[PDB]
């Protein structure tokens, strides 16, 4: 199917990460962060080339606190949302929880503090790929599909206006 081939190609083109290291791990964390930025930068380049440049992410110096923006296009109009997340100390085994704070209280597919609720298939998928998945995969396989489902709904109901 066209959906299948699209996902496969998208995810295939995101560089896999290498280093099993989290914030506790000194020079090995520095290396991991380089990998994360490299993977994110390649994903953004791919997004630009596919005419769907849908997010930007940055971090503090230590790489433990991430914030950025995402965009969703629906019916010719652009919707912008702020995102943030903290890196758990057991990363990359444990995936961060992405938050969209301005949507807190606006959808039931979300925990406290705007933390998005992904499907139950996300955790096993992440766990069996450790440590090759990183924040670029978290965006492509976590937030992106969440937006694709939730944002059109919130628009159709008039809960978000652009």
């Amino acid at each position: 199917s066209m959906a299948d081939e699209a996902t496969r190609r998208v995810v295939s083109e995101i560089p896999v990460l290498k280093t099993n290291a989290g914030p506790r791990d000194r020079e090995l964390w520095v290396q991991r962060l380089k990998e994360e930025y490299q993977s994110l930068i390649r994903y953004v380049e791919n997004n630009k080339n596919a005419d769907n440049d849908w997010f930007r992410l940055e971090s503090n110096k230590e790489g433990t606190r991430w914030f950025g923006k995402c965009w969703y296009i629906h019916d010719l109009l652009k919707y912008e949302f702020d995102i943030e997340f903290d890196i758990p100390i057991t990363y990359p085994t444990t995936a961060p929880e992405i938050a969209v704070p301005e949507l807190d209280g606006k959808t039931a597919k979300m925990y406290r503090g705007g933390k998005i609720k992904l499907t139950d298939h996300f955790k096993p998928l992440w766990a069996r790929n450790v440590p090759k998945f990183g924040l670029a995969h978290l965006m492509a396989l976590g937030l992106g599909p969440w937006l694709a489902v939730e944002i059109p709904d919130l628009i159709q109901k008039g809960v978000i206006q652009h």
Binding site: D4, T7, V11, S12, A108, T119, D120, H121, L125, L141
Partner: protein, 82 residues
């Protein structure tokens, strides 16, 4: 007396599949439980649909589904609360 289904896990970007063979009289809900077990995903937050994206009534046998829909199925994450 058995039928085989090709079941693809759509939540995994490799799109891996397994072929599951069950007696024709097996309730289709058992096929869903078998597929979920095999892919190591919860049955209660998974669903099976046809290769072409069609909903399947669970209240029928495997053989029923095999002829009505076809051998090729997708196991997908389900819409479920909490």
């Amino acid at each position: 007396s058995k039928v085989s289904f090709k079941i693809t896990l759509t939540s995994d970007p490799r799109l891996p599949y397994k072929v599951l063979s069950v007696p024709e009289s097996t309730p289709f809900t058992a096929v869903l439980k078998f597929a979920a077990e095999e892919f190591k995903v919860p049955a209660a937050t998974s669903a099976i649909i046809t290769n072409d994206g069609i909903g399947i009534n669970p209240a029928q046998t495997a053989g029923n589904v095999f002829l009505k829909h076809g051998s090729e199925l997708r196991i997908i994450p389900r819409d479920r609360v909490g």
